[PDB]
């Protein structure tokens, strides 16, 4: 949207106040902004402000949403928030509660770990019963089963998750998350590697299932990035290479830029690409 603010004696300046992702014709996702963005005389300026203020408001809405997740209860914040924040909330809830169960086991033989696992099992029925069969709109539809698939895998792991404490490898094998409070910031964690969420508005995207082979890729790529390299997967056609890369981009909050090399290429354009990659902070996936 563009709202004209009438400055005294200057023609009214149009300023951005909310952002929209449209899919199909009428189905869309809207995102408000408290911090505003104002057009100016230099195009680079208002584009840069758009990017920054987007990042900042995404951060603050998430900082709130992480308290609301455990306060309000499942249905309220899943219905209230947007898709990206909802998925983050589900992951952070599960890791925190599972952690708490594991220490409570460490103190003495306890059922509380089992009570937390049972709580996840209970969450499953309420999500599955209602929001799946009946719902309005395409974007809202895609959101729900995006939650459902994650929760299916979640409970499947939690059933067999025989780890005594956090240090155990079986717990140190999945994509855990922690939204640190004392220094207010997200941090996603793998076996050892860690990195902060990059705060890019994507709305509802059809992320994919998690087979063990995808775990092999996740661990491999995290290690390679910890040693400052670039993964180059290989195989036959149609085994989920490009989409696996794109999903590791999506989960980490970053924006990926696929291209398509071909014999009619020249190194100047590749240099242009790589310069953009190093300057911005984005990921590249040179298909073929």
């Amino acid at each position: 949207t563009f709202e004209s603010a009438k400055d005294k004696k200057n023609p009214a300046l149009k300023q951005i106040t909310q952002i929209q992702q449209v899919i199909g014709r009428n189905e869309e996702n809207i995102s408000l902004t408290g911090y505003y963005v104002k057009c100016e005389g230099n195009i680079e300026d208002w584009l840069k402000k758009l990017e920054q203020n987007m990042q900042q408001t995404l951060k603050d809405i998430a900082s709130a949403a992480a308290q609301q997740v455990f306060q309000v209860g499942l249905k309220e914040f899943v219905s209230s928030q947007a898709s990206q924040i909802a998925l983050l909330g589900l992951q952070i809830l599960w890791t925190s509660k599972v952690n708490e169960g594991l220490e409570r086991l460490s103190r003495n033989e306890r059922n509380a770990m089992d009570i937390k696992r049972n709580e996840i099992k209970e969450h499953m029925n309420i999500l599955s019963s209602m929001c799946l069969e009946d719902l309005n709109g395409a974007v809202e539809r895609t959101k729900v089963e995006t939650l459902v698939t994650i929760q299916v895998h979640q409970k499947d792991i939690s059933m067999d998750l025989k780890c005594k404490d956090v240090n155990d490898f079986e717990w140190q094998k999945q994509t855990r998350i922690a939204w640190k409070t004392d220094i207010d910031e997200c941090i996603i964690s793998i076996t050892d590697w860690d990195s902060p969420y990059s705060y890019e508005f994507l709305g509802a995207k059809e992320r994919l299932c998690i087979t063990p082979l995808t775990d092999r890729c996740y661990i491999t790529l995290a290690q390679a990035m910890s040693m400052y390299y670039g993964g180059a997967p290989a195989g036959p056609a149609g085994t989920g290479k490009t989409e696996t890369v794109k999903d590791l981009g999506r989960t980490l909050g970053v924006f990926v830029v696929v291209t398509n090399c071909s014999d009619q290429h020249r190194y100047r354009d590749m240099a242009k690409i790589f310069k953009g990659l190093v300057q911005s902070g984005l990921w590249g996936c040179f298909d073929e």
Binding site: G230, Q264, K272, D287
Partner: protein, 673 residues
Amino acid sequence: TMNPGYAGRQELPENLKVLFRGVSMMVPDREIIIKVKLASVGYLQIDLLAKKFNVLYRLCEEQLSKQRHYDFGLRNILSVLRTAGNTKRQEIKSDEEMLLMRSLRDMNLSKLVADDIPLFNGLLADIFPKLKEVPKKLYPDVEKKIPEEINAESYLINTPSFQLKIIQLYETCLVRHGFMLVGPTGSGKSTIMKILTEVLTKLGSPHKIVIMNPKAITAEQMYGVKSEISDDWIPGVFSTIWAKSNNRALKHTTWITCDGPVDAIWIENLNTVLDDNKILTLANGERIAMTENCKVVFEVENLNNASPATVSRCGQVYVSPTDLGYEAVIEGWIRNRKASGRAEESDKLGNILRKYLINMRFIELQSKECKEPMMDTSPVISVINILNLLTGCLQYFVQTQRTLSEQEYEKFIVYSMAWAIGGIYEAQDRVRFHELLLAKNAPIPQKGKENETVFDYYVSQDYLDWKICSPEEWVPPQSLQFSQLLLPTLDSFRAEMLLNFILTQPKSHTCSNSALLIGGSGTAKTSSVLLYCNKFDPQKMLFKRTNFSSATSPFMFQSTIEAECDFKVGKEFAPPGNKMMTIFIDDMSMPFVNKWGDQITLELVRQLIETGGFYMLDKTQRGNQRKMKNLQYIGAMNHPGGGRNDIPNRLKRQFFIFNMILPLSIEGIYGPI
């Protein structure tokens, strides 16, 4: 995400292998993904069904027949899943396994060739023995709409196979990005596309179709490059059509049709557009986003140079030779004859034709020996040929509005089909042919038949007689060997006799008004052709000559035709080309066949004959085509086989083909001089 090992694939020099760490992704999982997706939709019979999916697709992959275009990878599976969401979302609470059997079967039917269908559904029975049968969910509006326009045309016969194939095309259109119509020549692919577009347009929601030929232009021009002289970009044809098509705020639904062979080099750089990314990417640095306004279709004969990375990206539909038999085409022509010349002719002509064609043609291929058919063919082409000949045969009595008896018509059909199935054989096979016709066919000349074949004589328009001669004519007084140009032979006269019939016919459907001879190197090709060509009247009928060598490129042929017309006669131009012109070519064989087997010069000719015109290349505008509103075409072959090349089979459907034997009379050619 490199792809190890195909055609057109290099290696990474060892400086570059250092940086990247490997990840070997050979076999994806297939069961867990299915079961969790079924959970995501919200099913209840998850764990059993997952095993059903996996086992069925495995068994289908291994123990079914090996065809290049089959695919059962993850793209197909995900297509089935994203389909299956809606069916459960519908009100029905019926048992899931029924719905799932219906979905799988009805999805995978389209690609399968004739033989594999029984094996496929026999295999289905072994996994769902509880379920017996289900009907196919049939869409009422389209099935009622189709016969309406099939009747609206003159020359269209509805048959059940067309219903089946066109509806299957509708479904695969509904699900996936793009698709292919694999199937042999003369099988009705283009007609199917046209009629489908018509039905979609009838109930609102318009539909437009564009055509292209990928190996009649160079790929550098297809997608454009950076200029190799002035250091500046040029636009690409296909990308220009893309940009012109995917604008929002339009009402069309464009279907870009590529039409030719599938060579890996040019197609494979459309992976991103045909993948779930659906974004086009260029070496310019330009990225164009796909919309739902647009679809991509290929009217290609069959894949023989395709890796699975392009087989599995797009859906597909298989036309078979028996879907539209040649007989149905004959009935369409009959429907045309009862349009205007409807006195009794359709009935009378055919009353011989039906039995005389159905129960005869297959008793010539190998009933009697006939083991030197110099041009191997599928016999539908012969049928199109004889029909086109017979129309020209009766054109004269169409002109005077005279209706004839049955017996004369039977003689005419005998004459018509004597040639055009006899045009591809040698004297020995011709006498065996002749004996067949004596045994079980309508009368041929019996007045003298003094060791002379049926081919020797012709039927006369004035009366029912079988005579032939060559008129006497000597020379002019000049003594140059050229001035002794050529003499009136028997071979030349019969050649004019056959040629002129087709060449008078005015652009009927299934008639390109194009001819083609076959004869040995030095068997009176340019002789007879030039004898014809001198007889033109340059006041309303012109002529042009061209020859072929191995390294003649499409750009050369483009140049000569553009120089021939000298005008864009589509935009109401060319007073001097308003007279009728002919393009004559000595030898269409010689252009260099590519390594794969698909030569890249004749395709420009084939887009010229089939549709007229082509895309321009003058560094100024790209997406647009010149138009030929009038032209004519003639060719000549050199006994293909062995060392001699052959023409593309898709092109054989258009040219009149027949032999050009040696004369056996050369004592009587040089007598006069």
